[PDB]
Amino acid sequence: KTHVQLSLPVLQVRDVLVRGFGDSVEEVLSEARQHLKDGTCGLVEVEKGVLPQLEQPYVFIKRSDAAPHGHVMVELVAELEGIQYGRSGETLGVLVPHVGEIPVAYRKVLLRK
């Protein structure tokens, strides 16, 4: 399928144990996609002070379109030293590995895969 319905645990930035997916734009997009497929991906909502507490390169979920079945349609965009790889809409947040942190909410998305 070109899209997959996912329910992503929303994590507080200070609870996150593994604060990024790797060391290159291509690696972080790859790992983010593997973790999304394996159900081991969390979401951190971006506010003042969040990104400096996470590791670059960043993987964002961005709105790809305007929402089936309550799931916002999203795609992945990476960012390294102020350059983005991908073009999309509003940031829903930054993806991180999930290793059992307790979420504050779940965010339903339809991921372009």
Swiss-Prot record:
Subcellular location: Host cytoplasm
Domain CoV Nsp1 globular: 2-113
Region annotation (Disordered) ranges: 1-113
Function field: Inhibits host translation by associating with the open head conformation of the 40S subunit. The C-terminus binds to and obstructs ribosomal mRNA entry tunnel. Thereby inhibits antiviral response triggered by innate immunity or interferons. The nsp1-40S ribosome complex further induces an endonucleolytic cleavage near the 5'UTR of host mRNAs, targeting them for degradation. This inhibits the integrated stress response (ISR) in the infected cell by preventing EIF2S1/eIF2-alpha phosphorylation upstream of stress granule formation and depletes host G3BP1.
Name of the molecule in the record: Host translation inhibitor nsp1
Organism encoding this protein: Severe acute respiratory syndrome coronavirus 2
Native organism taxonomy: Viruses, Riboviria, Orthornavirae, Pisuviricota, Pisoniviricetes
Gene expressing this chain: rep
Shown residues in whole-protein numbering: 11 to 125 of 7096
